[PDB]
Design an enzyme around this catalytic site. Structure first.
Site, mmCIF file in Angstrom:
data_model
loop_
_atom_site.group_PDB
_atom_site.id
_atom_site.type_symbol
_atom_site.label_atom_id
_atom_site.label_comp_id
_atom_site.label_asym_id
_atom_site.label_seq_id
_atom_site.Cartn_x
_atom_site.Cartn_y
_atom_site.Cartn_z
ATOM 1 N N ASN A 1 -30.337 29.425 -15.865
ATOM 2 C CA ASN A 1 -30.058 29.198 -17.275
ATOM 3 C C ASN A 1 -31.222 29.569 -18.215
ATOM 4 O OD1 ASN A 1 -27.591 26.455 -17.827
ATOM 5 N ND2 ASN A 1 -27.302 28.639 -17.549
ATOM 6 N N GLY B 1 -23.106 16.156 -11.483
ATOM 7 C CA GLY B 1 -22.604 15.423 -10.325
ATOM 8 C C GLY B 1 -21.363 16.049 -9.694
ATOM 9 N N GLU C 1 -17.808 42.752 2.585
ATOM 10 C CA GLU C 1 -18.738 43.808 2.225
ATOM 11 C C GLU C 1 -19.958 43.295 1.437
ATOM 12 O OE1 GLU C 1 -16.947 47.525 0.598
ATOM 13 O OE2 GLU C 1 -19.040 48.205 0.507
ATOM 14 N N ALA D 1 -19.726 23.491 -16.260
ATOM 15 C CA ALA D 1 -20.326 24.818 -16.194
ATOM 16 C C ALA D 1 -19.370 25.788 -15.550
ATOM 17 C CB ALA D 1 -21.635 24.764 -15.427
HETATM 18 N N1 LIG Z 1 -24.542 28.426 -18.274
HETATM 19 C C1 LIG Z 1 -23.939 27.213 -18.471
HETATM 20 N N2 LIG Z 1 -24.472 26.100 -17.967
HETATM 21 C C2 LIG Z 1 -23.844 24.901 -18.169
HETATM 22 C C3 LIG Z 1 -22.607 24.789 -18.907
HETATM 23 N N3 LIG Z 1 -22.240 23.472 -18.931
HETATM 24 C C4 LIG Z 1 -23.149 22.795 -18.287
HETATM 25 N N4 LIG Z 1 -24.134 23.645 -17.795
HETATM 26 C C5 LIG Z 1 -25.299 23.327 -17.015
HETATM 27 O O1 LIG Z 1 -24.888 22.580 -15.849
HETATM 28 C C6 LIG Z 1 -25.716 21.368 -15.760
HETATM 29 C C7 LIG Z 1 -24.890 20.175 -16.147
HETATM 30 O O2 LIG Z 1 -23.939 20.046 -15.117
HETATM 31 P P1 LIG Z 1 -22.331 20.126 -15.587
HETATM 32 O O3 LIG Z 1 -21.530 21.310 -14.934
HETATM 33 O O4 LIG Z 1 -22.211 20.087 -17.096
HETATM 34 O O5 LIG Z 1 -21.768 18.689 -15.088
HETATM 35 P P2 LIG Z 1 -20.488 18.523 -14.151
HETATM 36 O O6 LIG Z 1 -20.332 19.541 -12.977
HETATM 37 O O7 LIG Z 1 -19.272 18.442 -14.987
HETATM 38 O O8 LIG Z 1 -20.725 17.120 -13.368
HETATM 39 P P3 LIG Z 1 -20.610 15.652 -14.101
HETATM 40 O O9 LIG Z 1 -20.404 15.830 -15.547
HETATM 41 O O10 LIG Z 1 -21.930 14.876 -13.755
HETATM 42 O O11 LIG Z 1 -19.343 14.905 -13.489
HETATM 43 C C8 LIG Z 1 -26.944 21.583 -16.712
HETATM 44 O O12 LIG Z 1 -27.891 22.428 -16.055
HETATM 45 C C9 LIG Z 1 -26.255 22.400 -17.818
HETATM 46 O O13 LIG Z 1 -27.175 23.162 -18.585
HETATM 47 C C10 LIG Z 1 -22.046 26.030 -19.406
HETATM 48 O O14 LIG Z 1 -21.007 26.062 -20.060
HETATM 49 N N5 LIG Z 1 -22.762 27.191 -19.172
#
Ligand SMILES: Nc1nc2c(ncn2[C@@H]2O[C@H](COP(=O)(O)OP(=O)(O)OP(=O)(O)O)[C@@H](O)[C@H]2O)c(=O)[nH]1
Ligand SMILES: Nc1nc2c(ncn2[C@@H]2O[C@H](COP(=O)(O)OP(=O)(O)OP(=O)(O)O)[C@@H](O)[C@H]2O)c(=O)[nH]1
Ligand SMILES: Nc1nc2c(ncn2[C@@H]2O[C@H](COP(=O)(O)OP(=O)(O)O)[C@@H](O)[C@H]2O)c(=O)[nH]1
Ligand SMILES: Nc1nc2c(ncn2[C@@H]2O[C@H](COP(=O)(O)OP(=O)(O)O)[C@@H](O)[C@H]2O)c(=O)[nH]1
Ligand SMILES: [Mg+2]
Ligand SMILES: [Mg+2]
Lengths: 136, 431, 433, 429, 431
Positions: free
Chosen positions: C201, C139, C249, C12
């Site tokens: 989201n 994670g 700020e 994300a």
């Molecule tokens: N807005 C948005 N949310 C995302 C994206 N990718 C994953 N998420 C959200 O983040 C969560 C999944 O966590 P991720 O960031 O994909 O997983 P990670 O931090 O890589 O951790 P691990 O894969 O478990 O090692 C869910 O709520 C997804 O919907 C993105 O590109 N945009």
């Protein structure tokens, strides 16, 4: 109908100001320290690693116990088979020898009866000899 | 989390394993020589999960073929995709297990085990990022059951941090190869409860009932049953084989599917249901696909899902369809059937849509449920086990291998505790 | 200069980073190769460093415990924009387990990440602090971020740390354990963060469906919209603006209490690029849209809460006269209830730089735009929804063995949940008179 | 390599051996000289000269019967050393076969078996062929079985036993020899396939229109059944069953190791057109008492296990369809404690018949091996004849004269009573 | 079990023995010079049982000819097949036994015995597989009876593991050579009860009644009587002399025929009955054969078989006939006459069919029965013995030879115990 406008800043790509609709009904402003420490963090991360390592070693100790049991059942099957052999060997030798013993005993008893018939015959022969020749 | 190492043990294990390899090779555009002939890049994006790239070109399954008998091993080599497998990966003994778990687990099996481990270690050492293991076997025989669970235990010891996954085929009197199946199955379930992370419960009872009642067969063969299995195996592995967000690897799947360590027995489901000669039908919509989720008739385990509650569900849709339609049809099923989903595990049903449909079907759905109704499968094996065990019938063939009666009592006690545990969560309120 | 270091953690964080940096280069005229035609701003130097070759390199580090997502950056359009050493990856991910990201895997890549951040901080003559982008759900986003935040507080003591946090939604969710990871990360990060901009989201998904007529929004759709709001928040750091001119700020203007550091962002207008005619929306219409819960980045009801601080950040063809007239009209029709100890008012900033959109994107190009950042007690509703899902699962200890298996103690779950209860009690107590 | 050692004891054992090995050669294309113009290797070893030699030993305490092998058509098929004979027979006395006469040749027999086991890379075990009636078949087999348990421990030992019939019987003491051998062999045998000479005699009269059946008639029919059991071991078919599988699937308890063999079809080499019977018709014929190898009534008993060995033009579907109908038959009762009971073997090769024989060529055949409690009727008939004579101690002096004790007769009969009681107990619910 | 050693002692023994040798030589195609002139290779298959292969193409009877007088043996040498015998095998004295058992058993007999043993040892040690001995003698005289039983005892001692078989001719007042016959017979029966394995009870009383009543010979001679004996001897030895399954040797015959050691006295029977040279015009049918053979009139012992019960029966059919018909007729006789067969010896009647018929007959039947009716023979000798013994008549003939009265008392007592034993089994019930 009132509103107070207090100018804040003015720059090349912007302007800022404050708008006050109502002053705070209540006055006197809003009426941290950890820090943490690298040593504390390391201590907690290490404690967690040791919990993870302890449990992996516990699973391993359990898997090792199943491995010992595996050797034990293989060993049990070896022992039961050897015993089977042992018993079968002694049960047979006792049987073969007892049969030899009874068979030789039967053949001895019968040969002894035929032998006694021979003793009785020369005895009969002795009697005739006393009847014959004498008076004759 | 890249490579998976696949193991096939015994007759059933190798027949269903061969079928899986031929089905997925077709989906990934791999011909029976190992060369790629496909028309798409999604087919190759995650090829590395199941195939090794050979010395210039060609793709070779990361599969180990195991049996205590040479027969089945010849049958595979002679089969459709038989020549695709690595020849050094065929590990076979000369004397079978005689349909005896004790022979597969302790005697004959223990004698061949290290040769199998040597082949799995070579495949494992070659991995950049090993996910873990996938084992296909039956629970009713001697090799797949006894030796298969011995392999699980030996693999667990050498790779304790890797995921252990199985496709375990449950015996049924309706389709049996041996008199002692309840014994071999009970002894194996005990092993699986303790040593696997995830098990797909493939019930020959359910497979038979589908072929007889729904496919209108009459007298079904292993070929008929294996056609349902290959469709199920292709369906449940879709998320591992193609790019996607949901349950894209063995550990992420286990994290979403297993709330309690021992409750890792999945009830797979599939729609549409078809026969090998049944080809050509055209039908089944998004609502029709979703409706099978609660349909007992579409379950690969002989359990009625409406007799229990879902802890967790993974639903996979294949083909060209609207994600909007899928999402709302999946939401409707959950709201309409809220009493079959535990309320203490929020948002417990996850959906994935893969564009590539399986061969023959324009549209399909695969369900992976962790349902408390799976206790019905274990109760059935337990009742058959007890009918034999009460009389100590055929016991001398196991004790003759060095086993004690206690092992039988322990295995059945563990299987009954598992039944009690599903029952506990079925009754849990939360609330 | 007044440099800011951006840290992108997990999928994300990395993916939103792509959207933000694509947009920043789009706002500063930086080509994907790092080239920028010299022309008499120069605040953009707060986010981009310069090389001997005349290239402009983002002051950012991308981290993931897996290489897939970052490998796309290393291979993609903006591959020449970032140096290979600022793109850090491990081999195995945290498998949606906070414990795995924080305790097991994280521990292997942490020193490497800190060393890379330290190398970026050395190039700074007046480091303001850090912008940390991550999901609550994954994670890595949860576990690795909280590990990173704790260390940064050790290495940079005082320095400001702001977050852009992805609050989970079931419609796009990948894990059942997301509420656990959310609570664990919030507890651990709470004292280390100065200001956090949560991005729900579901709110983004709903704006994309309504406002942009996108039937089934994708991460690209969501990220491009998120990037617009981030751009609005960071614009006065990257241009010679007048409001939120430095990181300190943000705390000053929006955060009167250390734990109560979660402002609500509301953005307007969001218009489909394939609409027709239109418009153009006035300062009044866009200001009115700031008081509409549909345009919020987090789902909650400010009517059920009290404001403790409000900032209105305008962009483009906007005049102070229009702004004041628009605020005056709203005060008549709406309550806009502030807490007793705060004045009912707004700190307003106009940034003359025009709103920018990605060429073939879903958003229409607008002359005027506004982002409202408000610290409302209503944001506690988002914590309550998360806490409830946590409680349902935790009462049965569902999935807990996954965390315990990684060396985390069950007591950590209780500690984290108790901190959330105190946070909920804090929002309640703050809005009383 | 999954080898099986066949042991042929006494006249019956040797004569059935002739019929079996003549048939095996016909089935594998082995000429009577061992030459051939793979699975059979389990039963035949190979020499550097390309000759195929049976993995078998033929034993008899008299040379007459084996001298016919040494002089006959299949002389050269066997090496002289595997054809063992003494000078004097056991004179229909178990005691002479077991002790008096047997003890003179036992070490020689064991030495030859040892030499055969030495050529095995994966010995499965032993197939022992003998009658219950003769002094050699009874006494020498009992001795052999005990010694094989010493030398090979628990290695599998299976029997093909000729149950006596008065119509072909040679001795009044046959029930004594039957009970003595059964008692002594009981703990040393893993599985025994009894062949009641009256059942065979009656199949030969009824099905083959043979007025006065001879040993050749009886043996050719017996050989057909035995070849069905060994077909799974000697070929690689659609479904195979090894020695271990036979044991596991047919025997629920160590003592209850006496399966019933039923063979179908048995048709005369003169007539139709019998109407190439279907898998269903041949399967159904297996549960009909006329085709049984032992006279008994399975309708008065309960099945504990069923092993169905199909050969020829047979498909798994047809087999399962046929078994499914047996499962619906209320009249075919299985025990409480047997959730299933079925085990299937399928081989490609149709049953080959001896050129000039009484049996017609069929496209498909089946041998069913079933463990029924009804087989206890055969033990009861034998026990009764034993009791009638034993109550008066008739002929006992012949055994006692050889060093046996009356206590043995009592021990043997008590074991048979327990065996009868065991079949009773196992059938209850 | 190959060779049988034949001994003929005294007048009767040598006359019947000579007759046996001439009858079997004809059946085996051996002329009076020892040369084989037959065909049907069945004649030579078991020629070794009674004949030695004489270096040259000659066959010489394994027979020892014994007498305390030269008379009968000079008469044998001068007889039809007289020159076929080994000249060194003729062992004779000059004294005679004077129809006194003691003289044959203790005096004259004991003085010639070692010369006989000399000749029997030479014949026995020449054997590859000795079955045992066959003795022909009378029980009424002195040599055959006294010396004959002395020979049995001496042979038993040296060859205890061999079978001892006799053809023993019982005296009758109808034929009679002396008043002392009841004594000589009782003293001999005592010896036979203890020392033989199998005895064919050939009764001169029955032989006389057949010749007088059936053959219509007003004054039967020994030649007439000996023609019935030779037919009987040929019949009862058929299974030993030709290839077959049933009672093919001396031990196998004893095992089938003797249920109790002392009850080894066979009642031989024959059909059809003929006089010398007289032939034939009408051959009996199988059904006729199987009735006649079980009738009083056809018994070679003067006992009515319907007065007792059969312990065991060996039935031999000679000639070209249907085995089906024989088996069917033999089963019918047993079912129809079940009251004359003990119930407690199942399947106690054994049947054999030899293709070679005896000379003169197209078809014949021989019956070997172990019947409890034989007690009538022993009772008859016992009554005659007691009538004399009660008065101590002729006792000094025996005491004069060194014998004691006790031997008489013991012999009598043993014969009466034998009668009581047959009676016990006659009355025994199955229950
Ligand atoms: N807005 C948005 N949310 C995302 C994206 N990718 C994953 N998420 C959200 O983040 C969560 C999944 O966590 P991720 O960031 O994909 O997983 P990670 O931090 O890589 O951790 P691990 O894969 O478990 O090692 C869910 O709520 C997804 O919907 C993105 O590109 N945009
Ligand atoms: N089916 C069959 N039964 C036979 C055959 N030969 C003998 N029997 C039966 O076996 C029993 C006789 O035992 P045998 O095997 O002939 O005798 P043996 O084992 O040689 O023992 P001895 O001759 O006493 O040393 C009777 O029941 C016969 O009917 C045969 O070729 N086929
Ligand atoms: N679905 C299915 N089940 C099978 C197949 N082959 C055997 N089985 C089942 O597997 C069990 C016997 O196990 P099997 O694999 O043959 O024995 P093994 O070779 O010792 O492992 C019984 O429950 C059979 O019904 C197959 O191809 N498909
Ligand atoms: N059947 C028959 N009986 C005979 C013959 N010769 C003598 N006997 C009988 O034999 C008994 C006399 O015995 P015998 O052999 O003459 O005296 P031995 O020479 O001392 O043994 C009497 O019962 C005679 O009837 C004979 O040739 N045939
Ligand atoms: Mg990730
Ligand atoms: Mg024999």
């Amino acid at each position: 109908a009132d509103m107070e406008v207090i100018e804040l800043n003015k720059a090349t790509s912007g302007q800022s100001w404050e708008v006050i609709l109502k002053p705070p009904s209540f006055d006197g402003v809003p009426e941290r320290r950890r820090d943490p420490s690298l040593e504390e963090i390391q201590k907690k991360l290490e404690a967690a690693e040791e919990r993870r390592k302890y449990q992996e070693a516990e699973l391993l100790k359990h898997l090792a116990e199943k491995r010992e049991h595996e050797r034990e059942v293989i060993q049990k099957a070896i022992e039961e088979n050897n015993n089977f052999i042992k018993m079968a060997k002694e049960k047979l030798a006792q049987k073969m020898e007892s049969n030899k013993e009874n068979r030789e005993a039967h053949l001895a008893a019968m040969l002894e009866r035929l032998q006694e018939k021979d003793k009785h015959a020369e005895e009969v022969r002795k009697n005739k000899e006393l009847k014959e020749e004498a008076s004759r | 989390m890249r490579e998976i190492v696949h193991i096939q043990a015994g007759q059933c294990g190798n027949q269903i394993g061969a079928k899986f390899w031929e089905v997925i090779s077709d989906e990934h555009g791999i011909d029976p020589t190992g060369s790629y002939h496909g028309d798409s890049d999604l087919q190759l994006e995650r090829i590395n999960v199941y195939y090794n790239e050979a010395t210039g070109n060609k793709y070779v399954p990361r599969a180990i073929l195991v049996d205590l008998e040479p027969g089945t091993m010849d049958s595979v080599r002679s089969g459709p995709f038989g020549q695709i497998f690595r020849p050094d990966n065929f590990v076979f003994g000369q004397s079978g297990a005689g349909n005896n778990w004790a022979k597969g687990h302790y005697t004959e099996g223990a004698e061949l085990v290290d040769s199998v481990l040597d082949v799995v270690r070579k495949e494992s050492e070659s991995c950049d990022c090993l996910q873990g293991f996938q084992l296909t076997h039956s629970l009713g025989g001697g090799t797949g059951s006894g030796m298969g669970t011995l392999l699980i235990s030996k693999i667990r010891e050498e790779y304790p941090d890797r995921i252990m996954n199985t496709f375990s085929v449950m015996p049924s009197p309706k389709v049996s190869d041996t008199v002692v199946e309840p014994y071999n199955a009970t002894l194996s379930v005990h092993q699986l409860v303790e040593n696997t992370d995830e098990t797909y419960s493939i019930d020959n009872e359910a497979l038979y009932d589908i072929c007889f009642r729904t496919l209108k067969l009459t007298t079904p063969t292993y070929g008929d049953l294996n056609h349902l299995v290959s469709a199920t195996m292709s369906g449940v592995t879709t998320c591992l084989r193609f790019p996607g967000q949901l349950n894209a690897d063995l550990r992420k799947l286990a994290v979403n599917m297993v709330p309690f360590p021992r409750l890792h027995f999945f009830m797979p489901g599939f729609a549409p249901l078809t026969s090998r000669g049944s080809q050509q039908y055209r039908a089944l919509t998004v609502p029709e696909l979703t409706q099978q989720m609660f349909d007992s008739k579409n379950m690969m385990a002989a359990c009625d899902p409406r007799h229990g509650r879902y802890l967790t569900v993974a639903t996979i849709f294949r083909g060209r369809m609207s994600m909007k339609e899928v999402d709302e049809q999946m939401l409707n099923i959950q709201n309409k059937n809220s009493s079959y989903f535990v309320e203490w595990i929020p948002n417990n049903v996850k959906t994935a849509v893969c564009d590539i449909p399986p061969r023959g079907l324009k549209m399909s759905s695969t369900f992976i449920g962790n349902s408390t109704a799976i206790q019905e499968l274990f109760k059935r094996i337990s009742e058959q086990f007890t009918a034999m065990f009460r009389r100590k019938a055929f016991l001398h063939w196991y004790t003759g291998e060095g086993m004690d009666e206690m092992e039988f009592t322990e295995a059945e006690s563990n299987m009954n505790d598992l039944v009690s545990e599903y029952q506990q969560y079925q009754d849990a309120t939360a609330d | 200069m007044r440099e800011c270091i951006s840290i992108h953690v997990g999928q994300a964080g990395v993916q939103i980073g792509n959207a933000c940096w694509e947009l920043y280069c789009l706002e500063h005229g930086i080509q994907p190769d790092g080239q920028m035609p010299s022309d008499k701003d120069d605040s953009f130097n707060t986010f981009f460093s310069e090389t001997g070759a005349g290239k402009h390199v983002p002051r950012a580090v991308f981290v993931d415990l897996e290489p897939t997502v970052i490998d796309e950056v290393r291979t993609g359009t903006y591959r020449q924009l970032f140096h290979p050493e600022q793109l850090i990856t491990g081999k195995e991910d945290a498998a949606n387990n906070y414990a795995r990201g924080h305790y097991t895997i994280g521990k292997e890549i942490i020193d490497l990440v800190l060393d890379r951040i330290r190398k970026l901080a050395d190039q700074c003559t007046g480091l303001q602090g850090f912008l940390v982008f991550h999901s609550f759900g994954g994670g890595t986003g949860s576990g690795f971020t909280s590990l990173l935040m704790e260390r940064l507080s050790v290495d940079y003591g005082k320095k400001s740390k702001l977050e852009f946090s992805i609050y989970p939604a079931p419609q796009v969710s990948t894990a059942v354990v997301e509420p656990y990871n959310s609570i664990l990360t919030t507890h651990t990060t709470l004292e280390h963060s100065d200001c956090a901009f949560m991005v729900d989201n579901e709110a983004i998904y709903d704006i994309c469906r309504r406002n942009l007529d996108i039937e089934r929004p994708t991460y690209t759709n969501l990220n491009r919209l998120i990037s617009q709001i981030v751009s609005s928040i960071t614009a006065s750091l990257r241009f010679d603006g007048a409001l939120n001119v430095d990181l300190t700020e943000f705390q000053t203007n929006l955060v009167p209490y250390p734990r109560i550091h979660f402002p609500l962002a509301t953005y307007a207008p969001v218009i489909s690029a394939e609409k027709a005619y239109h418009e153009q929306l006035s300062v009044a219409e866009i200001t009115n849209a700031c008081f509409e819960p549909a345009n919020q980045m987090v789902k909650c009801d400010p009517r059920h809460g009290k404001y403790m601080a409000c900032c209105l950040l305008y962009r483009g063809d906007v005049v102070p006269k229009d702004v004041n007239a628009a605020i005056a009209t709203i005060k008549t029709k709406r309550s806009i209830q502030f807490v007793d100890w705060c004045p009912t008012g707004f700190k307003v900033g106009i940034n003359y730089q025009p709103p920018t959109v990605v060429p073939g994107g879903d958003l229409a190009k607008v002359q005027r735009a506004v982002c409202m950042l408000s610290n409302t007690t209503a944001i506690a509703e988002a914590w309550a929804r998360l806490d409830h899902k946590f409680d349902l699962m935790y009462a049965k200890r569902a999935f807990v063995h996954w965390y315990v298996g990684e060396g985390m103690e069950e007591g950590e779950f209780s500690e984290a949940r108790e901190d959330m209860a105190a946070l909920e009690k804090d929002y309640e107590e703050v809005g009383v008179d």
